[PDB]
Amino acid sequence: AFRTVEIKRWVICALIGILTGLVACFIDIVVENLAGLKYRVIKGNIDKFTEKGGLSFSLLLWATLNAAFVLVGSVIVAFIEPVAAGSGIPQIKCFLNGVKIPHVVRLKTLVIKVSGVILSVVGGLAVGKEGPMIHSGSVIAAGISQGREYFRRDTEKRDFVSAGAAAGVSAAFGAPVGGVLFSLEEGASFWNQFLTWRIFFASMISTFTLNFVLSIYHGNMWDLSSPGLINFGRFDSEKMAYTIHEIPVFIAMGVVGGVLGAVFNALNYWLTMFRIRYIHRPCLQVIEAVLVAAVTATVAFVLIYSSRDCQPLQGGSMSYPLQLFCADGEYNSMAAAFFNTPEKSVVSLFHDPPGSYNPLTLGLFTLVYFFLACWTYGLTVSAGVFIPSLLIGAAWGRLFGISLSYLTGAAIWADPGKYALMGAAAQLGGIVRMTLSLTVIMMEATSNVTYGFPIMLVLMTAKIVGDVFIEGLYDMHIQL
Amino acid sequence: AFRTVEIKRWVICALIGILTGLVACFIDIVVENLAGLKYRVIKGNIDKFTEKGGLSFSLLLWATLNAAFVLVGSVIVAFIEPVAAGSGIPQIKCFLNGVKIPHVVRLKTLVIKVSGVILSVVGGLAVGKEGPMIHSGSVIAAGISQGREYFRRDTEKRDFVSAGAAAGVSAAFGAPVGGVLFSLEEGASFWNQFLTWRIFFASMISTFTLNFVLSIYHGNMWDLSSPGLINFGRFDSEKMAYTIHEIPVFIAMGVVGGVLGAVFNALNYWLTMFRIRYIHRPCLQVIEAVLVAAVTATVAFVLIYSSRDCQPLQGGSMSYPLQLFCADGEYNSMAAAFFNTPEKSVVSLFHDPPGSYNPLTLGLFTLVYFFLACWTYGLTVSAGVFIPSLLIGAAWGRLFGISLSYLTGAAIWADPGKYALMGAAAQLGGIVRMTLSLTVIMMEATSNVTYGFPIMLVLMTAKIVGDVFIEGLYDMHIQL
Amino acid sequence: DLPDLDPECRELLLDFANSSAELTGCLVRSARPVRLCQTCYPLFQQVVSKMDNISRARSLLMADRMQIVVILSEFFNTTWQEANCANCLTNNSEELSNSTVYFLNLFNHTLTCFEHNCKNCREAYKTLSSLYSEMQKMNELENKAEPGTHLCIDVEDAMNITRKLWSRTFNCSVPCSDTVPVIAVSVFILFLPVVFYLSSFLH
Amino acid sequence: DLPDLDPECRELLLDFANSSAELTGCLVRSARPVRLCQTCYPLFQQVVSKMDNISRARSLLMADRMQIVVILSEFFNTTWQEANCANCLTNNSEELSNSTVYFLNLFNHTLTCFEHNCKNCREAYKTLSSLYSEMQKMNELENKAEPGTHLCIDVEDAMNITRKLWSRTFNCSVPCSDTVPVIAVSVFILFLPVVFYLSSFLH
Ligand SMILES: *[C@@H]1O[C@H](CO)[C@@H](O[C@@H]2O[C@H](CO)[C@@H](O[C@@H]3O[C@H](CO)[C@@H](O)[C@H](O)[C@@H]3O)[C@H](O)[C@H]2NC(C)=O)[C@H](O)[C@H]1NC(C)=O
Ligand SMILES: *[C@@H]1O[C@H](CO)[C@@H](O[C@@H]2O[C@H](CO)[C@@H](O[C@@H]3O[C@H](CO)[C@@H](O)[C@H](O)[C@@H]3O)[C@H](O)[C@H]2NC(C)=O)[C@H](O)[C@H]1NC(C)=O
Ligand SMILES: *[C@@H]1O[C@H](CO)[C@@H](O)[C@H](O)[C@H]1NC(C)=O
Ligand SMILES: *[C@@H]1O[C@H](CO)[C@@H](O)[C@H](O)[C@H]1NC(C)=O
Ligand SMILES: *[C@@H]1O[C@H](CO)[C@@H](O)[C@H](O)[C@H]1NC(C)=O
Ligand SMILES: *[C@@H]1O[C@H](CO)[C@@H](O)[C@H](O)[C@H]1NC(C)=O
Ligand SMILES: *[C@@H]1O[C@H](CO)[C@@H](O)[C@H](O)[C@H]1NC(C)=O
Ligand SMILES: *[C@@H]1O[C@H](CO)[C@@H](O)[C@H](O)[C@H]1NC(C)=O
């Protein structure tokens, strides 16, 4: 009777979990290889022109490589499938809340968003690739329950796309239960207990699928040591301690995160109404994405070229290190922030022992990356806003940690790694303002429970101080 | 208007959190000092009679000290306030589900249960003291909203006693969010968002109150390193790893926990119907509690006296070590299991490096403590069944770990500490069968998230394999 | 100036090398019949004074990756603290800690009484064990620590050797021979609930 | 038999003590002008052979709490592995690893050319740096590891000394002097969105 219907529902949720894991590992593998190729070309070209003059050809090579990749990404996005632009999380959030924006029910949207996010992280923009993983999981789940049956019903479709969005969050951040609570914050029109188990089944099977395929891409099939596209794990040193000295410090850091999130949202609001008003033809959108990729390449190169902090290579801090003007055997330090992927600069900011970052270098990188991510977000590319927000927050959180380590006599409790974590949670809650799902995600991905209560306080403080100025980003883009 | 009503509700929840924390630290301080006095008397009396004959006077001293303390505890319980017996968790669970058993609305029940659980853990029975902490928090919360106003309403009273039960769980296990999800599994007649924040406010303020008063009882006021009455923390060594080799092993261990939980529930069911049928006068109940305290004292002393495993003192494994018949400088090992408090024998079973436990000594202790806890539970004393279940499960889980360390060639993945954890969760889910609240509690108290999914699997397996035989304990005692 | 050294700093390093070679010699001359804190305390003060002599210079400690002088000094401190040799010296150093010279005198007394070829020299051993327990309790009120903290290693190995002679070799512990009152009381108390449950069943 | 020792085991311990005292001497004779894997490889084979000689006996290793022989041998292994002296020996041991004797010969050649009183002996230094980078890449395909793994310590400190002479002391790096094409291209590309946004505003 009804038992075969529930087996059909559970096997559909198993397929959308497996397919979302395969799409996530496809994105990670292709981005890793293509960014490896592009950064090896540029590092091989800077070192050729380091002596004997030149070095403006390296800037043109960087700018044109960024421009070519984002030109491909925006001709794909802004001409063919225009709703594929952005992270798509506002569209899925309002899909779960009830209103159906068109052209989400097509497999073409999945192909354009996956290809766009491959060609945008490679393209050198300030883009995280786990923003649109939620939308990719959503359209996979919607496309499973269609044609080209009693699953085309809108009650059955909304629950399946809820499971797809949860599988997207779990494949993104390594958070199964975080994916469950993300799917339940929107469209919570019921507490169907079998629906939450379906959601958790798809969520956990998506994380385990991404483990299995990424580990067979690595050496050991038996390892499973990569739960997500970002994994800033192992917060269980003596730097795990949060203490009564630090709870009002975390509340104040949540206030600063909420203020800077309001600044981010307001500047992007004025920018995106300028883009609605004037830059609305598809050809102008393609040209604007090409220039902003060229500008983030050249402002990265101006900041690299005009920096004097040089530190020697510790074993894994620099992926593609270049010595620009440093001495032999010492490598550049600002070039470690624009050549690392943003999923690794965050981990480095969480884990480097104190005194490993210049305040001037990190401050300049923070300011330029803040304005770059604010400019790059409202574009016609397939692009998240998570890891830009998380890197901005980790960077100024580490600056806060260095300041607290200087004001006190280099105390044990003022470790800059922990304050980088709390800053990243503060800015991600200031820009986005999701309350509980980030608490569970930032508990899950760090594998620490004692960061549950202070991260939860920081997210509430950032949300409240942010909402007294301007709405959140994912809610603002349903109001244009 | 309504704002002053909500401030009244939140300040009442703050008071019940603070009062439940004070009751929890009162229980812990008095139990620690009185059990220290009693075990120092017995250890000072065994060492006097170790040579030069005697040693039967030590057995009489142990049996009469146990008998005297439980005689006081049962004349208090079985004569004055007869519903104060047991853990009271079935009564609170059916209070939240709607039916109101009488004589829970009195402060006398709070005094009798607190004094009974002091005089029962000291009395040497197989009793955990964090069973009735939930009922003590419940009657504190009910007594706050009474006389000797609009809070005597049954809608207002049920929500406050929900917050009191959550504060009891958080002060018990160190689990704030675990206390929240315990209070929401019963009486979930609504998802009032402000009610869950009230519950979490009382829960977190109860854990922090117990930290503050227990740390000022210890040396440092600034430490706060005791979140609950049991704290088996720090699972973040290389023994934290759960691996694809071990997921069917955890499912099988959940099966064994469910089977042994069914055995526990069935034997206690026949025993408690014998007690309903015949041993029902209050004087017979007092005599029966005196004999079972004398019997657990003398079977502890027969097992200590007839044991030959002797191991030297590592720095904190033995609280009150006695050398009975071992060589000088080597202390007895079975006497480390009956002289430690059950809140410390569990931590030792979770944390001792492998090869620190004899399989014969631990097997004998497991078998005798299983039948002793099964006999001692259905009595007229104020007594939990948590830490008896948790110690039984940790003991046979460690035996499973030693067996897996012997069958494989002492592999890295077959660490007996991790399997002691999973066994403790298995037996606590086999005897009690609460599904999700133990998953959150055993994540919270161990401060590890990677033990979320395997503990959740083990609890589901134990609950299912248990429910095909006999109902859970806390549901059976509403059906006599 | 870089690849070679300042000649006084070379002489300072040579002095530390000579002193530390003597200390490693002393630590392994006295390895198994443990006299580590008994024969190598002045050499340890010698080595830590030369290490303090270096850091009053700058080139010796942190001018290479390994810092072989610093990790050698840290190894000697770890061996010092694990041995807990501070109990074999007075609080003002370079003495022999009058609590422990009495123990070593009684330990030598006990072994010379063991050289008399069964159970005759027992009250010397009981005095030794009482003294050892007294020093253990002394090592928790003057230097506050956990129960069963580790004493000074040559004292602790002397007591180790005495107890391994007294139990594992000589086999002398005068056993209890009081089992049958224990078994009588135990079968009485275990038969008491049989009486209680049957009498309540038959009433 | 307990408090004293078997005379051959006493002789075995005395042999290990002599060899290990010589090794600690060698490690600190060659401390700052680092020749740790260059002058102390045969003494290290001597010490590890005597430690293997002890464990073929039973009383020397695990018959006391500290196990001073075992923790001393473990300290010499930790100093060996942190130095990564296996790159200064061939895969069959007790040789000098023909990749590195060429490097030490060129290092001595470069310093003797530095003894000629500015920027004249440069291609020797460039050959040295090319050789050092070649050995770094050789230390990741024959012995697979992460990028920037640590080479053998006397090689790595020789290259340390050469680079600290060449940059911090001699001050010779022939700077770029190509700023104004970079600043021209940079102000052009930064002025490009000003042109784009203003032209789209005025259309
Ligand atoms: C090349 O030579 C330079 C010498 O100028 C070496 O730099 C020094 O290296 C050591 C080893 O890391 C550093 O010591 C450190 O000291 C701090 C406390 O100040 C301590 O926390 C660390 O654990 C470590 O012991 C030292 O700071 C550093 N700099 C100076 C100016 O001495 C460099 O390591 C050499 N490179 C190689 C590859 O050998
Ligand atoms: C008293 O003397 C006895 C000698 O019979 C000492 O027992 C031995 O103590 C050492 C130190 O813990 C034990 O060594 C251990 O070996 C294992 C591997 O087998 C290793 O994993 C440990 O980390 C440690 O190195 C040894 O097993 C033990 N027993 C024997 C038979 O040798 C005892 O420590 C002495 N007591 C004191 C207080 O010195
Ligand atoms: C080095 O140590 C010796 C003895 O510890 C001392 O006499 C000498 O003055 C010290 N050297 C200096 C320069 O202080
Ligand atoms: C060695 O001596 C003491 C004892 O551990 C320690 O505090 C000191 O810092 C050490 N000296 C060194 C490493 O130079
Ligand atoms: C006992 O002490 C004396 C002097 O203190 C010494 O000559 C003798 O050798 C010692 N006995 C033993 C067995 O070492
Ligand atoms: C001890 O080592 C030496 C040299 O390594 C060797 O010649 C000798 O045979 C070894 N001793 C034994 C008993 O094998
Ligand atoms: C020292 O030599 C090797 C290298 O670390 C190691 O594998 C071996 O076990 C060590 N020998 C000892 C500690 O006796
Ligand atoms: C260079 O090597 C030769 C022999 O190999 C040696 O005599 C000379 O001292 C070395 N030069 C320096 C500066 O050490």
- Mutual orientation of helices B416-431 and B453-467 as an angle, nearest 10°? 40
Cα separations (Å) of A173 from A166, A195, A421?
A: 11, 22, 15
Give the span between the Cα atoms of A449 and A451, in whole angstroms: 5
Query: Quick one: B287 exposed, middle or buried, by C-beta within 10 A (0-12, 13-18, 19+)?
Result: middle
Nearest bound ligand to the CA of residue A314: 1
Task: Dig out the tokens for A3 from the structure.
Answer: 């038992």
Cβ distance of B449 and A450 shorter than 8 Å: no
Q: How far is CA B454 from the centre of its chain?
A: 22
Give the span between the Cα atoms of B131 and B117, in whole angstroms: 9
- Paired with B311 in beta bridges are B331
On whether the CB atoms of residues C180 and B56 are closer than 8 A, the answer is no
Total count of domains within chain C: 2
Q: Look up tokens 């704290």; give the residue.
A: B231
Instruction: Report yes or no on A224 lying in a domain.
Output: no
Cα separations (Å) of B415 from B42, B232, B396, B404?
A: 35, 17, 14, 8
Cα distance from B298 to chain C (closest Cα, Å)?
7
Interface of A with D in 303-342 (CB under 8 A): 305, 313-316, 318, 321, 325, 327-329
Q: Which residues of A touch D166 (CB under 8 A)?
A: 327-328
Total count of domains within chain B: 2
Q: Which residues of C touch B284 (CB under 8 A)?
A: 200
Same domain, A373 and A469: yes
Give the span between the Cα atoms of C19 and C25, in whole angstroms: 10
| Of A178, A141, A135, the residue nearest A156 (C-alpha) | A141
- Ligand 2, residues at Cβ distance < 6 Å: C 156-157, 160; D 62-65, 67
Give the span between the Cα atoms of B445 and B176, in whole angstroms: 10
Task: Dig out the tokens for B108 from the structure.
Answer: 């006398």
Give the span between the Cα atoms of D87 and A306, in whole angstroms: 38
Same domain, B51 and B108: yes
On whether the CB atoms of residues A23 and A140 are closer than 8 A, the answer is yes
Same domain, B179 and B288: no
> Any idea what DSSP says for residue A413?
S
Please, what's the b/e burial string for D95-121 (b: 16 or more CB within 10 A of its CB; e: otherwise)?
Answer: eebebbeebbebbeebbeebeeeeeee
Q: How many CB atoms lie within 10 A of CB A332?
A: 24
Considering only CB atoms, A295 lies closest to which of D147, D176, D193, namely D193
Nearest bound ligand to the CA of residue C82: 4
Is the CB of C64 within 6 Å of ligand 1?
yes
Is the CB of D49 within 6 Å of ligand 6?
yes
Task: Dig out the tokens for A105 from the structure.
Answer: 């029910």
What dihedral do alpha carbons A351, A353, A354, A357 form, nearest 10°?
-70
| Of A144, A116, A142, the residue nearest A129 (C-alpha) | A116
Q: Which residues contact A148 (CB under 8 A, 6 or more apart)?
A: none
Q: Look up tokens 């497991």; give the residue.
A: B366
- Paired with C67 in beta bridges are none
Cα distance from C113 to chain D (closest Cα, Å)?
14
Cα separations (Å) of A261 from A89, A273, A466, C200, D87?
A: 18, 18, 7, 75, 53
- Domain range enclosing A30: 3-217
Query: Quick one: B407 exposed, middle or buried, by C-beta within 10 A (0-12, 13-18, 19+)?
Result: exposed
Q: Which residue on chain C is closest to D83 by alpha carbon?
A: C66
Q: What's the distance, Cα to Cα, between the start and end of chain D in Å?
A: 104
Say whether A87 counts as a known binding-site residue: yes
Q: Name the resolution in angstroms.
A: 3.6
Nearest bound ligand to the CA of residue D61: 2
Task: Dig out the tokens for B104 from the structure.
Answer: 């829970």
Instruction: Let me know the angle formed at the C-alpha of C48 by C45 and C54, rounded to the nearest 5 degrees.
Output: 140
Same domain, C60 and C121: no
Is the CB of C108 within 6 Å of ligand 5?
yes
Query: Quick one: A387 exposed, middle or buried, by C-beta within 10 A (0-12, 13-18, 19+)?
Result: buried
Instruction: Report yes or no on C2 lying in a domain.
Output: no
Instruction: Report yes or no on C115 lying in a domain.
Output: yes
**How many angstroms separate the alpha carbon of residue C20 from the centre of ligand 7?**
23
Give the span between the Cα atoms of B176 and B207, in whole angstroms: 7
| Type of residue at D191 | F
On whether the CB atoms of residues C76 and C23 are closer than 8 A, the answer is yes
Task: Dig out the tokens for D99 from the structure.
Answer: 């990749």
Q: Is A64 on the interface with D (CB under 8 A)?
A: no
Residues contributing to the annotated binding site of B for chloride = 87, 386, 474
Same domain, D58 and D120: no
Instruction: Report yes or no on D180 lying in a domain.
Output: no
- Paired with A331 in beta bridges are A311
Give the span between the Cα atoms of B286 and B379, in whole angstroms: 9
Cα distance from B182 to chain C (closest Cα, Å)?
37
Is the CB of C186 within 6 Å of ligand 3?
no
DSSP states along C60-75: HHSSSSS-HHHHHHHH
Instruction: Let me know the angle formed at the C-alpha of D42 by D40 and D45, rounded to the nearest 5 degrees.
Output: 110
Task: Dig out the tokens for A327 from the structure.
Answer: 């001495």
Q: Which residues contact A66 (CB under 8 A, 6 or more apart)?
A: A123, A124, A125, A293, A294, A296, A297
- Domain range enclosing C123: 98-169
- Paired with A168 in beta bridges are none
On whether the CB atoms of residues A49 and A254 are closer than 8 A, the answer is no
Q: What are the φ/ψ torsions at residue D21 (nearest 5 degrees)?
A: -65, -40
Count of H helices and E strands in chain D?
9, 0
Dihedral-angle region of residue B52 (phi above 0 means left; psi in -120 to 50 means alpha; beta otherwise): left
Instruction: Report yes or no on D92 lying in a domain.
Output: no
- Paired with B332 in beta bridges are B310
- Ligand 4, residues at Cβ distance < 6 Å: C 48, 51, 73-74, 77, 81
Give the span between the Cα atoms of B17 and B160, in whole angstroms: 11
A402 membership: H or E segment, kind and range? helix A386-407
Cβ distance of B294 and C189 shorter than 8 Å: yes
Q: Which residues contact B353 (CB under 8 A, 6 or more apart)?
A: B417
Cα separations (Å) of D86 from D70, D92, D102, D153?
A: 22, 10, 16, 10
Same domain, B315 and B464: yes
Instruction: Report yes or no on B47 lying in a domain.
Output: yes
Instruction: Report yes or no on A410 lying in a domain.
Output: yes
Cα separations (Å) of B353 from B316, B361, B394, D16?
A: 13, 17, 14, 32
Q: Which residues contact B249 (CB under 8 A, 6 or more apart)?
A: B404
Report the CATH number that the domain containing residue B72 is assigned in CATH: 1.10.3080.10
Is the CB of C49 within 6 Å of ligand 3?
yes
Q: Is B302 on the interface with C (CB under 8 A)?
A: yes
Dihedral-angle region of residue A63 (phi above 0 means left; psi in -120 to 50 means alpha; beta otherwise): alpha
Same domain, A242 and A207: no
Task: Dig out the tokens for A319 from the structure.
Answer: 């992926």
Instruction: Report yes or no on D179 lying in a domain.
Output: no
Give the span between the Cα atoms of D58 and D70, in whole angstroms: 12
Same domain, C13 and C43: yes
Give the span between the Cα atoms of A146 and A152, in whole angstroms: 6
Query: Quick one: C159 exposed, middle or buried, by C-beta within 10 A (0-12, 13-18, 19+)?
Result: buried
Cβ distance of B447 and A450 shorter than 8 Å: yes
**How many angstroms separate the alpha carbon of residue C64 from the centre of ligand 1?**
6
**How many angstroms separate the alpha carbon of residue C75 from the centre of ligand 3?**
22
Q: Is A176 on the interface with B (CB under 8 A)?
A: yes
Q: How many CB atoms lie within 10 A of CB B267?
A: 16
Question: Residue D122: helix, strand or coil by DSSP?
Answer: coil
Same domain, C102 and C165: yes
Q: Which residues contact A90 (CB under 8 A, 6 or more apart)?
A: A474, A475, A477, A478
| Of A400, A460, A466, A465, the residue nearest A435 (C-alpha) | A460
Instruction: Report yes or no on B441 lying in a domain.
Output: yes
Instruction: Report yes or no on D163 lying in a domain.
Output: yes
Considering only CB atoms, D146 lies closest to which of A54, A315, A329, namely A315
Q: What are the φ/ψ torsions at residue C153 (nearest 5 degrees)?
A: -70, -35
Cβ distance of B447 and A444 shorter than 8 Å: no
Q: Which residues contact D187 (CB under 8 A, 6 or more apart)?
A: none
Task: Dig out the tokens for D77 from the structure.
Answer: 């292994």
Instruction: Report yes or no on A451 lying in a domain.
Output: yes
**How many angstroms separate the alpha carbon of residue C40 from the centre of ligand 7?**
26
Same domain, C76 and C115: no
Domain final position from D50, D83, D116: D83
Instruction: Let me know the angle formed at the C-alpha of A394 by A391 and A397, rounded to the nearest 5 degrees.
Output: 145
Strands A331-332 and B310-311, bridge-based pairing:
unpaired
Instruction: Indicate which technique resolved this structure.
Output: cryo-EM
A311 membership: H or E segment, kind and range? strand A310-311
Is the CB of D22 within 6 Å of ligand 1?
no
| Type of residue at C16 | F
| Type of residue at A395 | A
What dihedral do alpha carbons B334, B336, B340, B346 form, nearest 10°?
-80
Please, what's the b/e burial string for A75-94 (b: 16 or more CB within 10 A of its CB; e: otherwise)?
Answer: bbbbeebebbbbbbbbbbbb
> Any idea what DSSP says for residue D165?
I
Cβ distance of C182 and B315 shorter than 8 Å: no
**How many angstroms separate the alpha carbon of residue D115 from the centre of ligand 1?**
27
Same domain, C137 and C76: no
DSSP states along A218-258: SS-SS-----SS-------SGGG---TTTHHHHHHHHHHHH
Same domain, A356 and A404: yes
**How many angstroms separate the alpha carbon of residue C62 from the centre of ligand 1?**
5
Nearest bound ligand to the CA of residue C45: 3
Instruction: Report yes or no on B209 lying in a domain.
Output: yes
Dihedral-angle region of residue B86 (phi above 0 means left; psi in -120 to 50 means alpha; beta otherwise): left
Same domain, C70 and C131: no
Q: Which residues contact A143 (CB under 8 A, 6 or more apart)?
A: A105, A106, A107, A110
Considering only CB atoms, A244 lies closest to which of B177, B222, B453, namely B222
Same domain, C72 and C105: no
- Closest ligand 6 atom to the C-alpha of D49? 5
Instruction: Report yes or no on D187 lying in a domain.
Output: no
DSSP states along A314-363: -TTT-SS---SSS-TT-EESTHHHHSS-HHHHHHHHHHSPTT-S-HHHHH
A88 membership: H or E segment, kind and range? none
Same domain, A198 and A254: no
Give the span between the Cα atoms of B366 and B388, in whole angstroms: 10
On whether the CB atoms of residues D177 and D183 are closer than 8 A, the answer is no
On whether the CB atoms of residues A151 and A160 are closer than 8 A, the answer is yes
Same domain, A417 and A387: yes
Q: Which residues contact A137 (CB under 8 A, 6 or more apart)?
A: A16, A20, A23, A164, A165, A166, A167, A168, A169, A171, A206
Instruction: Report yes or no on D199 lying in a domain.
Output: no
Same domain, C30 and C58: yes
- Mutual orientation of helices D68-83 and C68-83 as an angle, nearest 10°? 160
Q: How many CB atoms lie within 10 A of CB B31?
A: 20
Same domain, A202 and A246: no
Q: Which residues of A touch B191 (CB under 8 A)?
A: 191
> Any idea what DSSP says for residue C86?
G
Task: Dig out the tokens for C163 from the structure.
Answer: 């107890």
Considering only CB atoms, B224 lies closest to which of A191, A244, A443, namely A244
Task: Dig out the tokens for B187 from the structure.
Answer: 């009486």
Same domain, B349 and B260: yes
Instruction: Let me know the angle formed at the C-alpha of C139 by C137 and C143, rounded to the nearest 5 degrees.
Output: 130
**How many angstroms separate the alpha carbon of residue C159 from the centre of ligand 2?**
15
Q: How many CB atoms lie within 10 A of CB B271?
A: 14
> Any idea what DSSP says for residue C173?
-
Same domain, A108 and A46: yes
Q: Look up tokens 């002008």; give the residue.
A: D33
Residues contributing to the annotated binding site of B = 87, 386, 474
Instruction: Let me know the angle formed at the C-alpha of A351 by A345 and A357, rounded to the nearest 5 degrees.
Output: 65
Q: Which residues contact A346 (CB under 8 A, 6 or more apart)?
A: A230, A232, A387, A390, A391, A394, A424
Give the span between the Cα atoms of B98 and A247, in whole angstroms: 39
Q: Which residues of B touch A443 (CB under 8 A)?
A: 449
Same domain, A258 and A212: no
Instruction: Report yes or no on B222 lying in a domain.
Output: no
Establish how many alpha carbons lie within 13 A of residue B136's alpha carbon, considering only the half-sphere containing its beta carbon. 34
| Of A223, A226, A227, A186, the residue nearest A204 (C-alpha) | A227
Count of H helices and E strands in chain A?
18, 2
Give the span between the Cα atoms of B398 and B345, in whole angstroms: 12
Is the CB of D154 within 6 Å of ligand 1?
no
On whether the CB atoms of residues A20 and A164 are closer than 8 A, the answer is yes
Task: Dig out the tokens for C110 from the structure.
Answer: 């006990």
On whether the CB atoms of residues A382 and A133 are closer than 8 A, the answer is no
Give the span between the Cα atoms of D184 and D178, in whole angstroms: 11
On whether the CB atoms of residues B84 and B118 are closer than 8 A, the answer is no
| Of D63, D67, D23, the residue nearest D47 (C-alpha) | D23
Is the CB of C55 within 6 Å of ligand 5?
no
Give the span between the Cα atoms of B441 and B462, in whole angstroms: 17
Q: How many CB atoms lie within 10 A of CB B193?
A: 8
Same domain, D47 and D107: no
Give the span between the Cα atoms of B289 and B68, in whole angstroms: 10
Cα separations (Å) of A262 from A266, A368, A369, A473, B451?
A: 6, 17, 16, 9, 37
3-state secondary structure chain B: CCHHHHHHHHHHHHHHHHHHHHHHHHHHHHHHHHHHHHHHHHHHHHCCCCCCCCCHHHHHHHHHHHHHHHHHHHHHHHHHCHHHCCCCHHHHHHHHHCCCCCCCCCHHHHHHHHHHHHHHHCCCCCCCCCCCHHHHHHHHHHHHCCCCCCCCCHHHHHHHHHHHHHHHHHHHHCCHHHHHHHHHHCCCCCCCHHHHHHHHHHHHHHHHHHHHHHHHHCCCCCCCCCCCCCCCCCCCCHHHCCCCCCHHHHHHHHHHHHHHHHHHHHHHHHHHHHHHHCCCCHHHHHHHHHHHHHHHHHHHHHHHHCCCCEECCCCCCCCCCCCCCCCCCCEECCHHHHCCCHHHHHHHHHHCCCCCCCHHHHHHHHHHHHHHHHHHHCCCCCCCCHHHHHHHHHHHHHHHHHHHHHHCCCCCCCCHHHHHHHHHHHHHHHHCCCCCHHHHHHHHCCCCCCCCHHHHHHHHHHHHHHHCCCCCHHHHCCCC
Alpha helical stretches, state H, chain C: 7-29, 36-39, 41-54, 58-61, 68-83, 98-114, 123-141, 153-163, 179-201
Task: Let me know if chains C and A touch, i.e. at least 3 Cβ pairs under 8 angstroms.
Answer: no
Alpha helical stretches, state H, D55-178: 58-61, 68-83, 98-114, 123-141, 153-163
Give the span between the Cα atoms of A109 and A91, in whole angstroms: 13
Is the CB of C167 within 6 Å of ligand 3?
no
* Count of residues in chain C: 203
Query: Quick one: D126 exposed, middle or buried, by C-beta within 10 A (0-12, 13-18, 19+)?
Result: exposed
